[PDB]
């Protein structure tokens, strides 16, 4: 009658923040414990594991100590990178790996970047083709800025997304808005 | 190449049958078939402890499996239902006390079961030129690509510059949006941004292209409509750089 | 180690011509387990021969019981041919009447 | 005549020919009686008696079967993985026996002994690995390694000291109509291979008795012929026993001899057979 209980829901953290994803289990015996990471659009992959009590899993700056007394396997990282944005699954299987694995529901991690010079502005973009279609581009806002939901049936506002121009080491947040209407930007 | 899966994407009518193939050339004894839905997490359908042996998982109804050869784990849908709309993942592992008995997962298989194949629409792809106000104020140029009216949400968006795939200064929406969130078989929309230097956009020899790879109807899929058959195809849009 | 099988051949009931009986062949004290045991009737193998599942003694040496239902006549001669790795030739132990 | 404790034990015989080939034979016994078989191909337990499941529910039986199936599977894979390190030369064999026995006083003793090449290798005492002197450095290495796997030691401790004693008492009661019965032997005399020129071998056959303790002796009226060679107590397929008691005598010193048989089923009416 094994079970895995991990962090309730989505966790948003700024770039270089301390991360802690709590995980506790209930099992009879001496099971092995794992952390699986699932990157957007990908399958699950082992992050780290600890086959026996008091073992310590270490990978990509992340670490987790198997504490039998507190029946836990808490995930920790000193300085979260933007590339850590993924779903983290705590896992458990009887030792030997001869039996099925028990996964938690998974915790979503959203690592938001630190914008050094926030310059929020709304731009109107013209379609390259003859069509006089237009889109609205909300960009250069800070990470704490929330994207206002549509609350209009025919107006579409995307979620915020981060783009990195790696050559110039400039990151920027952006949301796109559009409508098939008269529709003014922002 | 580890754990592979075929198909990558599939759209089925209700009642239609299909087989998902999972292969591993790692000599792994154990193989697993899961489905992943939002809020539900990973749910095991069926699993195999060795060549010739299969067992039921948490969600086994509507599915059958087979392990004739140790290399492959076949997942079958005898009568597709809309509830079977999910992303299917195959895993494999090697038991043993000294073994690295963790699970190895395949890339995923997106499945969408619709009541009617005339709900399948390819995307419309449009490229929006950077704003002059952004160019003068930041000395940066953001192109926007918008793919609209596609169903199912089985698309791959990519940016091309002088016929080369770009990844830097690029950002695409994590998931396509529902154009009509209140209806089941609503069409989707996906937005992407390509930010470049103002000087780069200002060169008239630079060619920008937004490619959207759509997965839709196959050759064996019946089509009896005036509309063009919404087959697997590439829909693209372009913009050329410009001085003044 | 490498131990030679002890062979003992016996009948369930006293030998009485023209009436049903059981022929037994108990092979014990051998190692390794691999062994070939045959119950013979006038020098040729009996096809219908039942045997126990492999068991072993406290000393780890193996033992098996081979048996068959038979009806002996005045002219009939019975035996038990056993072949093991410790044997250079199959040892035949006859059933004394 | 000699009798020991009533025991339930499971046995294993594993032959490791090469690094890619290994075959395991397993069974379950209540003393000399086989109550369990193992179908190695399907990986299931075969119940040879209607009471072979004891007083254990169909859920608990399916849990133990699963433990043994995973064990028989894992055992050959783990030995073949560790053989390199232990310095094993192919081919070799392994034997195992585990279970529990009821003594006089209601004391159930649980046991687990392993062997390598028909020789003692290990034993279990107070839920702990005890390497055998015959096992050598390999047994000490095996016990030092197996301790590091607390899940295995916990599973072995549960099975030996909790699951087994109650399984035993349950199977003894469930099969008492077969276990607790009296079957009378039949006795006959014959003449054996001549032990010399002026010698005779008088054979006394005793067969069809249950339970196993028996007494057979050659007599001169009440004079116990001390030179009586006692054979082994041999099995009969129908859960009965066979025993033959021989006597080497000079041609003439065989005239007034008889065979006396004592068994628990005979109700004080010993079988006596005069040589003739
Ligand atoms: C009815 C009673 C009959 C009479 C008694 C019968 C006697 C039977 C005695 C012994 C025979 C059966 C032993 C079973 C032990 C397997 C251990 C196991 O299952 O758990 C581990 C799996 O470990 C594995 O992965 C299985 C691999 C077993 C092969 C190991 C070979 C070397 C061990 C050589 C061994 C030689 C031993 C010599 C002693 C030193 C996992 O541990 P866990 O994570 O804690 O999960 C268990 C709890 N749970 C299942 C609830 C989740
Ligand atoms: C209800 C009723 C259900 C009814 C179920 C009943 C069905 C019967 C099932 C039969 C299966 C029984 C098997 C149990 C026997 C237990 C004995 C185990 C002993 O094994 C050993 O001791 C191992 C021998 C060690 C030799 C080491 C040689 C060195 C090789 C290197 C490998 C080392 C591995 C390191 C770990
Ligand atoms: C291993 O032994 C088995 C039995 O003889 C045989 O079938 C198998 O081919 C052998 N393989 C090798 C090359 O070790
Ligand atoms: Cl591969």
GROMACS .gro file of C-alpha atoms in nm, chain D residues 184-188 204-207 215-217 219 258-263 265-266 268-274:
model
   28
  711UNK     CA    1  -0.114  -5.142   0.846
  712UNK     CA    2   0.190  -5.297   0.674
  713UNK     CA    3   0.194  -5.631   0.491
  714UNK     CA    4   0.493  -5.854   0.550
  715UNK     CA    5   0.657  -6.128   0.340
  731UNK     CA    6   1.210  -5.969   0.555
  732UNK     CA    7   1.002  -5.724   0.350
  733UNK     CA    8   0.763  -5.483   0.530
  734UNK     CA    9   0.548  -5.261   0.306
  742UNK     CA   10   1.038  -5.185   1.417
  743UNK     CA   11   1.156  -5.499   1.223
  744UNK     CA   12   1.382  -5.770   1.364
  746UNK     CA   13   1.399  -6.356   1.596
  785UNK     CA   14   1.115  -6.586   1.225
  786UNK     CA   15   1.058  -6.218   1.144
  787UNK     CA   16   0.869  -5.994   1.393
  788UNK     CA   17   0.718  -5.661   1.282
  789UNK     CA   18   0.607  -5.385   1.522
  790UNK     CA   19   0.399  -5.083   1.400
  792UNK     CA   20  -0.130  -4.936   1.331
  793UNK     CA   21  -0.118  -5.311   1.428
  795UNK     CA   22  -0.062  -5.486   1.954
  796UNK     CA   23  -0.094  -5.768   1.699
  797UNK     CA   24   0.272  -5.798   1.579
  798UNK     CA   25   0.331  -5.969   1.239
  799UNK     CA   26   0.542  -6.283   1.286
  800UNK     CA   27   0.667  -6.483   0.985
  801UNK     CA   28   0.844  -6.818   1.043
   0.00000   0.00000   0.00000
